[PDB]
């Protein structure tokens, strides 16, 4: 048994692979949705940080 707090609240032994991503079904190429003009500040999909 474990009485000291640090042993009780320990994550030593966690065997579960925590995954940040997951597979989704994708039998066809993605479709294209209608889009219109956007003249807006703050929102900027073209700009990135490689």
């Amino acid at each position: 048994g474990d009485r000291v707090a640090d042993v009780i609240e320990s994550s030593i032994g966690d065997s579960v692979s925590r995954a940040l991503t997951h597979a989704l079904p994708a039998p066809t190429g993605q479709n294209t949705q209608v889009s219109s003009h956007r003249l807006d500040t703050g929102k900027v999909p073209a700009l990135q940080a490689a």
Binding site: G13, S17, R18
Partner: peptide, 30 residues
């Protein structure tokens, strides 16, 4: 900084009892 990358989208973990093969109790120094 420029965020953090988690390789192959998976965090490190200890080896499970089903993936393991060696029978001695491991030591995990922490």
């Amino acid at each position: 900084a420029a965020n953090i990358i988690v390789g192959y989208g998976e965090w490190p973990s200890y080896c499970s009892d089903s993936d393991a093969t060696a029978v001695d109790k491991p030591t995990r120094p922490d």
